[PDB]
Enzyme design. Structure first.
Site, PDB file in Angstrom:
ATOM      1  N   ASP A 153       1.499  -9.528 -19.197  1.00 50.55           N
ATOM      2  CA  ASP A 153       0.414 -10.071 -18.379  1.00 50.55           C
ATOM      3  C   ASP A 153      -0.091 -11.433 -18.865  1.00 50.55           C
ATOM      4  O   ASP A 153      -0.882 -12.077 -18.178  1.00 50.55           O
ATOM      5  CB  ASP A 153      -0.754  -9.063 -18.215  1.00 50.55           C
ATOM      6  CG  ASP A 153      -1.557  -8.853 -19.498  1.00 50.55           C
ATOM      7  OD1 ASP A 153      -0.963  -8.851 -20.584  1.00 50.55           O
ATOM      8  OD2 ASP A 153      -2.795  -8.675 -19.416  1.00 50.55           O
ATOM      9  N   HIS A 198      -1.561 -13.622 -25.913  1.00 52.95           N
ATOM     10  CA  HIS A 198      -0.872 -12.587 -26.706  1.00 52.95           C
ATOM     11  C   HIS A 198       0.465 -12.239 -26.090  1.00 52.95           C
ATOM     12  O   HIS A 198       0.807 -12.799 -25.043  1.00 52.95           O
ATOM     13  CB  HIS A 198      -1.736 -11.344 -26.957  1.00 52.95           C
ATOM     14  CG  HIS A 198      -1.999 -10.496 -25.743  1.00 52.95           C
ATOM     15  ND1 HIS A 198      -2.278 -11.028 -24.502  1.00 52.95           N
ATOM     16  CD2 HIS A 198      -2.062  -9.150 -25.600  1.00 52.95           C
ATOM     17  CE1 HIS A 198      -2.495 -10.043 -23.643  1.00 52.95           C
ATOM     18  NE2 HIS A 198      -2.376  -8.897 -24.284  1.00 52.95           N
ATOM     19  N   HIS A 212      -6.839  -6.015 -30.248  1.00 56.36           N
ATOM     20  CA  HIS A 212      -6.115  -5.430 -29.113  1.00 56.36           C
ATOM     21  C   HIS A 212      -4.607  -5.441 -29.385  1.00 56.36           C
ATOM     22  O   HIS A 212      -3.913  -4.474 -29.077  1.00 56.36           O
ATOM     23  CB  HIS A 212      -6.450  -6.183 -27.815  1.00 56.36           C
ATOM     24  CG  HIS A 212      -5.509  -5.893 -26.680  1.00 56.36           C
ATOM     25  ND1 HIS A 212      -5.395  -4.646 -26.106  1.00 56.36           N
ATOM     26  CD2 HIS A 212      -4.643  -6.696 -26.008  1.00 56.36           C
ATOM     27  CE1 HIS A 212      -4.508  -4.691 -25.125  1.00 56.36           C
ATOM     28  NE2 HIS A 212      -4.033  -5.923 -25.050  1.00 56.36           N
ATOM     29  N   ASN A 229      -5.473   0.593 -23.759  1.00 54.85           N
ATOM     30  CA  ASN A 229      -4.192   0.924 -24.373  1.00 54.85           C
ATOM     31  C   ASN A 229      -4.138   0.546 -25.854  1.00 54.85           C
ATOM     32  O   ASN A 229      -4.118  -0.637 -26.199  1.00 54.85           O
ATOM     33  CB  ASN A 229      -3.060   0.230 -23.610  1.00 54.85           C
ATOM     34  CG  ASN A 229      -1.693   0.783 -23.961  1.00 54.85           C
ATOM     35  OD1 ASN A 229      -1.510   1.396 -25.012  1.00 54.85           O
ATOM     36  ND2 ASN A 229      -0.725   0.573 -23.074  1.00 54.85           N
ATOM     37  N   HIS A 288       1.897  -9.592 -24.664  1.00 54.41           N
ATOM     38  CA  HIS A 288       2.055  -8.724 -23.484  1.00 54.41           C
ATOM     39  C   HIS A 288       2.456  -9.506 -22.229  1.00 54.41           C
ATOM     40  O   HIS A 288       2.108 -10.680 -22.056  1.00 54.41           O
ATOM     41  CB  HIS A 288       0.773  -7.915 -23.257  1.00 54.41           C
ATOM     42  CG  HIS A 288       0.594  -6.786 -24.227  1.00 54.41           C
ATOM     43  ND1 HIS A 288      -0.616  -6.159 -24.423  1.00 54.41           N
ATOM     44  CD2 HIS A 288       1.473  -6.174 -25.057  1.00 54.41           C
ATOM     45  CE1 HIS A 288      -0.473  -5.202 -25.324  1.00 54.41           C
ATOM     46  NE2 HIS A 288       0.785  -5.192 -25.725  1.00 54.41           N
TER      47      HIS A 288
END
Ligand SMILES: [Zn+2]
Length: 223
Positions: free
Chosen positions: A78, A74, A136, A164, A76
């Site tokens: 990280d 995804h 998410h 989150n 993000h």
């Protein structure tokens, strides 16, 4: 911050763990995989930083396993933090069309290769990318290793709290989680982004955590 870790999960499958400091809370671990297929290496998710990505890649490359590609689960950081470094080395990077559009919107460097559709085989017969739907994040995908029956679930897998919700789709998440559970109930191991590696049970908890988040519409250790 702790040093990058690389730990054997199965024959030809390693979990890489990198770390990020959250302000005044502490260090949070992020898991990705390195999968060895036909004597070559594939990254499933990148570390947050160029330094850790370079360390991880050079570690395998030096020892005779050429890095053939990376897939990010995804948008993000990280999961995508090493894309700039990989592109800079002409190492093929992959992400879904939705993920690349989110990176572009967020002013981040994009994967060199994209895909769309429910299923996409990064390596035929051996690495499959699957989109269960929004959860998410709007773009989240999972990565299936059919030879080992191992599922990298990333940030979609949330057995102990949805975390989150800034980019989440609480409305769609239950349906997506149901689809994922039905698709990979056969998984022997399920690998989340931060939580402990588990068995197919993680797909159940996630689902129940989704349906329970809808209604009510770093880890948290307070108890
Ligand atoms: Zn995320």
């Amino acid at each position: 911050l702790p040093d990058l870790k690389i730990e054997k999960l199965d024959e030809g499958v390693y979990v890489h763990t990198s770390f990020e400091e959250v302000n005044g809370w502490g260090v949070v671990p992020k898991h990705g995989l390195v999968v060895l297929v036909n004597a070559e290496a594939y990254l499933i998710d990148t570390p947050f930083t160029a330094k850790d990505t370079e360390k991880l890649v050079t570690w395998f490359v030096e020892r005779g396993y050429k890095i053939k590609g990376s897939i990010s689960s995804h948008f993000h950081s990280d999961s995508t933090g090493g894309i700039e470094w990989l592109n800079s080395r002409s190492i093929p990077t992959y992400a879904s069309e939705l993920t690349n559009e989110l990176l572009k919107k967020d002013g981040k460097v994009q994967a060199t290769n994209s895909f769309s559709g429910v299923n996409y085989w990064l390596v035929k017969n051996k690495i499959e990318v699957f989109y269960p739907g929004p959860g998410h994040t709007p773009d989240n995908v999972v990565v299936w290793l059919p030879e080992r029956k191992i599922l990298f679930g990333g940030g979609f897998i949330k057995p102990y709290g949805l975390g989150n919700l800034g980019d989440a789709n609480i409305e769609a998440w239950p349906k997506s989680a149901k689809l994922l559970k039905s698709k990979y109930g056969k998984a022997k191991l399920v690998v989340p982004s931060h939580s402990e590696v588990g068995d197919a049970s993680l797909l159940k908890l996630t689902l129940e955590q989704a349906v329970k988040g809808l209604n009510e519409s770093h880890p948290q250790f307070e108890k």
